[PDB]
């Protein structure tokens, strides 16, 4: 009777004692948490061996500490690794290195369908292509039809093609991201292909989202002869978005919508429903 009550009081006291011990541990971890500390990218998740390559161009072999999970180790992630014991103390915000080197972000366009008119029949096609899948995803899912993840618009911008895109984004309350196609086209060895895989990864994270691509003839030349060799940056970037789009289906998490100043490019490669399904004039 007494024995039980004293063992109970002792349990109540003890939680405090233990709570004190952790308190001690945390102050140490917090002092190491805040930067300046190295970022890194994991490549290999006996020993629990993980390799990280830290941004000082050096590879190290470390054990995994219980202050991270092996489910937080993966490439294309920041992890915080110590300067001097080279052990992954903490895991840092998502996505390694550059988080898309330039994108213009417009988090509410104020465009309305009352700002345009007499484009009515074309308003119906766009709304069917991207909005109807988003809203009634369970209906498309249950039917078993693939739902686009890209739409193609062509025509003049400023007639009201560009305005209506911005308007759809506003109405769904999607993130608008304007990516300009000449920006991708780097003279240095594949920057653009890399930008696009990051463009899509961030797009998947941000969903509902409209990835707005101004110009699709600027990267939409790719040549047809042995001249593609030179202009391989422009072929590769265009191909990389289409492979990604077809690498998933039956989802409408990311929309990509493409715009041209004057159409001069269309390809048999663009076709497929998970790729650029919709062709609006």
């Amino acid at each position: 009777i007494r024995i039980f009550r004293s063992e109970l009081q002792r349990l109540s006291h003890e939680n405090n004692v233990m709570l004190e011990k952790i308190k001690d541990n945390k102050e140490k971890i917090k002092n190491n948490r805040q930067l300046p500390y190295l970022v890194a990218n994991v490549v290999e998740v006996v020993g629990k061996a993980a390799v990280v390559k830290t941004s000082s161009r050096q590879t190290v072999f470390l054990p995994m500490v219980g202050l991270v999970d092996p489910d937080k180790l993966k490439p294309n992630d920041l992890v915080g690794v110590n300067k001097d014991s080279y052990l992954i103390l903490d895991t840092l915000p998502s996505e390694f290195d550059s988080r898309v080197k330039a994108m213009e972000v417009d988090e509410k366009p104020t465009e309305t369908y009352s700002d345009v008119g007499g484009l009515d029949k074309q308003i119906e096609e766009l709304v069917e292509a991207i909005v109807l899948p988003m809203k009634r995803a369970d209906k498309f899912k249950d039917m078993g039809i693939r739902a686009p993840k890209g739409a193609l618009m062509y025509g003049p911008p400023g007639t009201g093609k560009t305005l209506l895109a911005r308007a759809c984004a506003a109405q769904t309350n999607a993130t608008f991201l304007k990516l300009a196609a000449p920006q991708l086209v780097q003279m240095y060895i594949g920057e653009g292909a890399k930008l696009v895989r990051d463009a899509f990864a961030l797009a998947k994270e941000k969903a509902p989202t409209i990835i707005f691509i101004d110009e699709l003839d600027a990267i939409g030349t790719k040549r047809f002869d042995s001249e593609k060799s030179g202009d391989r940056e422009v072929q590769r970037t265009m191909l990389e978005l289409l492979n990604q789009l077809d690498g998933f289906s039956s989802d409408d998490r990311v929309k990509v919508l493409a715009a041209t100043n004057r159409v001069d490019v269309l390809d048999p490669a663009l076709l497929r429903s998970g790729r650029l399904d919709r062709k609006i004039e």
């Binding site: 805040q34 930067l35 300046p36 500390y37 970022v39 941004s55 000082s56 920041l78 840092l92 915000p93 998502s94 290195d97 550059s98 988080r99 898309v100 080197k101 330039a102």
Partner: protein, 61 residues
């Protein structure tokens, strides 16, 4: 004030509650949180501003 990538070369001054921005290829201190006046303004290489990696030092000076 003129820049193409941000530099404060370590940041002495100041979850997260302190902000270190150095965007160069060699030495990357990557904060995933922007939002703030925190150190008491520009410091340590004065080029606070706009990144080509999105650390986003929002609005001190």
């Amino acid at each position: 004030h003129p820049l193409q990538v941000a530099r404060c070369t370590k940041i002495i001054k100041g979850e997260d509650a302190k902000y270190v921005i150095n965007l160069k290829q060699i030495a990357k201190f990557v904060v995933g949180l922007g939002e703030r006046v925190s150190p008491t303004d520009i410091e340590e290489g004065m080029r606070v501003g706009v990144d080509r990696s999105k650390y986003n030092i929002e609005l001190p000076l």
